[PDB]
Amino acid sequence: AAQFTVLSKLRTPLGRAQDTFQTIEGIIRSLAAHTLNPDQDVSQWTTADNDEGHGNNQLRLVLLLQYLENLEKLMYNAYEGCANALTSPPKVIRTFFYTNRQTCQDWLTRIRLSIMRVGLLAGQPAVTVRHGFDLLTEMKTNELEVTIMMVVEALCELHCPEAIQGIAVWSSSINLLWINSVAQQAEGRFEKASVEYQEHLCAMTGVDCCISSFDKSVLTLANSSPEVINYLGNKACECYISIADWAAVQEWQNSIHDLKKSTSSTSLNLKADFNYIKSLSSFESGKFVECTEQLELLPGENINLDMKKLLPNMLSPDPRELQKSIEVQLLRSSVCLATALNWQSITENVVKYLKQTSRIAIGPLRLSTLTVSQSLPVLSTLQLYCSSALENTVSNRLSTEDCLIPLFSEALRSCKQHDVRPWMQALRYTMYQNQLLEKIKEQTVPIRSHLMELGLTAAKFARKRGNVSLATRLLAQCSETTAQDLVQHFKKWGPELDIEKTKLLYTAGQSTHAMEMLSSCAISFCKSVKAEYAVAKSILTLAKWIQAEWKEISGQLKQVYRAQHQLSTLSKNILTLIELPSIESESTVHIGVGEPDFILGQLYHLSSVQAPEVAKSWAALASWAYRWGRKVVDNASXXXXXXXXXXXXXXXXXXXXXXXXXXXXXXXXXXXXXXXXXXEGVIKVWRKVVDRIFSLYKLSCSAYFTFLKLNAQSTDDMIVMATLRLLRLLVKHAGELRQYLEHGLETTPTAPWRGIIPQLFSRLNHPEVYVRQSICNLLCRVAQDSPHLILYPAIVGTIQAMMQDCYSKIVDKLSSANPTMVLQVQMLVAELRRVTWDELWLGVLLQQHMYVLXXXXXXXXXXXXXXXXPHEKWFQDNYGDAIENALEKLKXXXXXXXXXXXXXXXXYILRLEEIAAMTNTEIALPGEVSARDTVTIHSVGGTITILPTKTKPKKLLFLGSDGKSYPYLFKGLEDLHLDERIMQFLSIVNTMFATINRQETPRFHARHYSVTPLGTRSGLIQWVDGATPLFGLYKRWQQREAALQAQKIVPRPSELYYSKIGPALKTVGLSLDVSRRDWPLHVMKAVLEELMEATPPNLLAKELWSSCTTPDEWWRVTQSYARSTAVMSMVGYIIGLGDRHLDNVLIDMTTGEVVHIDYNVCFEKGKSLRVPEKVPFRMTQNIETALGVTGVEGVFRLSCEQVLHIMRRGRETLLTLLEAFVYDPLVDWTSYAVSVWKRVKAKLEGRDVDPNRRMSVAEQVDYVIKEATNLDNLAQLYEGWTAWV
Ligand SMILES: O=P(O)(O)O[C@H]1[C@H](OP(=O)(O)O)[C@H](OP(=O)(O)O)[C@H](OP(=O)(O)O)[C@@H](OP(=O)(O)O)[C@H]1OP(=O)(O)O
Ligand SMILES: Nc1ncnc2c1ncn2[C@@H]1O[C@H](COP(=O)(O)OP(=O)(O)NP(=O)(O)O)[C@@H](O)[C@H]1O
């Protein structure tokens, strides 16, 4: 319909071009006016004949908005155009829409204000958000506050506090301190938002309107225009209603009435049916008489004592009204059933009522599919589930498990992105059944456990968002206004309830009381029957809380330590917990280990022994032991004295004792030192002391091995860290603690080692004997049941005998299960290596022509001819006279003629038959690290394409069993060994975002491809599909502009830049012959400014908008793009990625994510070039506009801060991996690697640019953004970078 309207020059059956606009404008204005006053009763939009017409009204309202959205897109494409998103319309249409652009834009900006209200009414925040952003962008020259209000409300409905915060900062640069409060409410903090709203209202009116609430001192620690006043007043009521605080609602109503009567506002009025609120309060309080009496005033069919027309007339198409109607119907059914209990008397009519209610409640879920939303409504889903549960209990009389709401504790780890309202609705309908159980004499289903589970989960979610009052009420209900009250009232779900109470006490501010309660609870849990997950959780929580207050708790730990070798409540409790009866001695930790630090180790050991099935207990103990072991070993670089004195039957004894442990080939050095100092039983004491010093490493190794064995449950990020630590300790110290490493490696599984395989292969040249054997055995074992990860590396390596015997053994071991596969793999590798002739001859001739102006040339030519002796036959039959020509020219135009002929014949498409072809192959694809069900190669592409201007790349495709094509890129003489390390690093970084990705719609991810080297110079790189280069959009825009200007090729970036820098330099005195270094800064800034003003800054934004189908999809794609850009910007700045031109940045229109390809200018290599680069990442005009109206002030900055926080927390693993990359014999860095590692470490530690000052995450993000967005740095950049676009 939209296409027909645009293609007809707006001349539809509705009338002329103006009649259509007038009709749409009138309908939109009427609907918008009805939003302000819900009593307008718009004809054909608020009335229906039955319950089915009402759903149709909402459907029609959504369709109208979709039609307008498509019409605008088509008009824009008609007068401006796109780049592959939409097809160019005919010339006649383009000519008409180009001369009428002003009228079309004026009409749109004229109705944009009403469209936002209509979108807000229809429950489609995406429409109003997009329209608001478009309206704000045009406002570059009191309608500004209304737009901000609608935009903030829409963003609040979408649960996007980051965008709200960005908008607050953006608006602060134009009396808008109330936006932050809405941001707080968008995160689920209803208790704090109401207080902030009251504080703002008391200042915008001058009259105090506060109400009684929880202690404001601890509330903050746990987490003038009439329109603004009314908006804030209504939001406060909404916040109070969300947590179901009826008393607070009544108090707020009284306060609002008093404030209105004390200021004669005449415009401030709460828009909320209080009769419905009173009915809800009465129903929840158990007073069914008052509830049924109050329900008679609400609209709709009378309470049960036709079925199709249950909803009343004049109903607004607002989903909020539908939710209220459904709630009223549910309450009526519940009251009717309760009165009927005290089976077809009053059970026959209620079933039909509930069935109709359920049929109506599925409307919103159905509408959620018409628009690609990727998610279902939350309140609407629970309404339908509650109706189903009520229907089941009315017919089964609470006798089947289907009568309960399917809300369990499992939602704790899968629904962290939702507020507490769903739990409130579930609890409201569950308590009714619990109370109803008292009127059923027959057997029923146990609801007490379900109620306890729901209450505990609701309390946990309430505490996680600062709602102390709600959490207190829920905990009290489960247990059947000041912190002191909570302390005096709280100090299969027993242990969970106790731990939750302790956590709430800690959140309220009483850390000492919470610690004491946890200690008392742990002492009892350690003497329980099961206590599996209860002891570990309590001990780990107590240990974590102790580290927080390390300054105020260090004194107590010392006292408890001294008390053990011979006290407050917490100290005595800790003493009793560690002194419990069933491996760490004080002698091995009395050298450089702090006294309070030993208590933590004992606590970790106790947690690990009381719960051997918990992986967390082992990981914590292993980490603590490893850190202290490294510290004691670094710092160290009675029985012993008695043994030495007895075995040596005054200064000599002291010297010998000092030399025995001075700095412990070691045996020879010790013997020489002893002989030179004293002048053989010293070997026993020396061995005993060296073994005692390495006790921490042994304990850490045992704990790490146990943790890895328990993961054959825990995040892979921790697994990679443990494996890296074990490998590093085994490489560094191998002979001192070999007894543990040997057995552990011989018994450890092979699943947690699939992430450090390259490091294992790299450490195969260790200067030891059993170390190499152990690594080889581990790799051989990994090959079994998983040969797709050892096949290519072993085959390439086998194609210093230490680095050869291991590879041969691995290949032999892997060939014992499929010799045919190994042979085919070797044949394929050989064919690929030989498919890298004409190219060699051309290169040799070109090099000789330049190196000529003797015997070296003759020798090189002879070697090349000897090396060259389907495709080779043709080359030989066509140029076999080369040898004769070279021999005749030895005693020289033949070489020049051959080179010229080759160059002329060079100026792509090849065939596989002439350059063999297998089928039904069972070889793994080149790179299947993450593939549970590996796909084998099925065929090979019959054609090969050669990429021009980029050396000699070959695009080869591979067929799979899944009938899908997998493109690849073959490179010759590139040495892609370093790229593989970068790709592995990217995967390790992505590994740290697994936890945060479970409760965030826009996932934190860094797109990357696979790199498979095929030797020392060649390699196979994966091809990225679905992502287009950013330069394409600029090129298409240039072509469109040229075509438009032709009526009434395109220049290259260098040609366009010089054409402007020439006259500018000539107008000041200098000339083009002057060196680029000696160029005025003002001239460069002026040319950059002139170039930016000529290019449109919304190319990418418009392309992304035109690619999406619905507003919801547009919002999802925009958020995905912002988060991906932030993640890649921080990753690139941390590693030091450079050369970020338009051809190296790709964009996936399907999802909105970005992906980089070239990585040869990493590790700050772009800073030292002919034209140095001073920007950390690309933040040009087009990149910033695609982020929205606020730019880098909202989601981008916050996402960047989050990414930096995660990296700073997990920098240990990144540095460990980088160290391994540095010490790699297969990586060609050319102490450059040491400098690179130090630079990365400094950036990760926050000490990027500072002598001794350590910056913060926010400061670092701000500094990087400022350095990447300033015009002074973008002007003095290479012209090929295209800083103006
Ligand atoms: O109360 P719980 O249900 O046990 O929640 C805890 C804990 O919550 P609190 O910090 O509010 O006490 C943390 O939840 P998030 O921070 O991830 O939202 C997190 O612990 P940390 O972040 O402090 O490490 C995680 O525990 P963990 O990360 O160790 O798995 C989690 O669940 P569990 O404690 O049950 O594991
Ligand atoms: N993984 C990839 N996926 C898709 N396209 C790619 C990939 N890698 C490179 N390309 C593109 O395919 C071509 C490969 O040629 P390439 O050799 O990378 O260009 P180049 O000028 O030599 N830059 P460089 O790679 O640093 O030498 C270029 O046009 C790249 O933009």
Swiss-Prot record:
HEAT repeats: 751-786
Region ranges (Catalytic loop): 1136-1144
Transmembrane regions: none
Residues in the signal sequence: none
Domain FATC span(s) in chain numbering: 1253-1285
Region of interest (G-loop), residue spans: 946-952
Localization annotation: Nucleus; Cytoplasm
All residue ranges annotated as the FAT domain in the record: 320-799
Effect of residue 1139 to A: Loss of function
Domain PI3K/PI4K catalytic: 940-1230
Tissue: Widely expressed, with highest level in heart and skeletal muscle. Expressed in placenta, brain, lung and spleen, but not in liver.
UniProt-annotated stretches for the region Activation loop: 1156-1180
PTM comment: Autophosphorylated.
Highest taxon listed in the record's lineage: Eukaryota
Role this protein plays: Serine/threonine protein kinase involved in both mRNA surveillance and genotoxic stress response pathways. Recognizes the substrate consensus sequence [ST]-Q. Plays a central role in nonsense-mediated decay (NMD) of mRNAs containing premature stop codons by phosphorylating UPF1/RENT1. Recruited by release factors to stalled ribosomes together with SMG8 and SMG9 (forming the SMG1C protein kinase complex), and UPF1 to form the transient SURF (SMG1-UPF1-eRF1-eRF3) complex.
Family: Belongs to the PI3/PI4-kinase family.
Subunit relationships: Component of the SMG1C complex composed of SMG1, SMG8 and SMG9; the recruitment of SMG8 to SMG1 N-terminus induces a large conformational change in the SMG1 C-terminal head domain containing the catalytic domain. Component of the transient SURF (SMG1-UPF1-eRF1-eRF3) complex. Part of a complex composed of SMG1, DHX34 and UPF1; within the complex DHX34 acts as a scaffolding protein to facilitate SMG1 phosphorylation of UPF1. Interacts with PRKCI. Interacts with TELO2 and TTI1. Interacts with RUVBL1 and RUVBL2. Interacts with UPF2.
Misc remark: This gene is located in a region of chromosome 16 that contains 2 segmental duplications. Other genes that are highly related to this exist, but they probably represent pseudogenes.
Protein name: Serine/threonine-protein kinase SMG1
Gene name of the encoded protein: SMG1
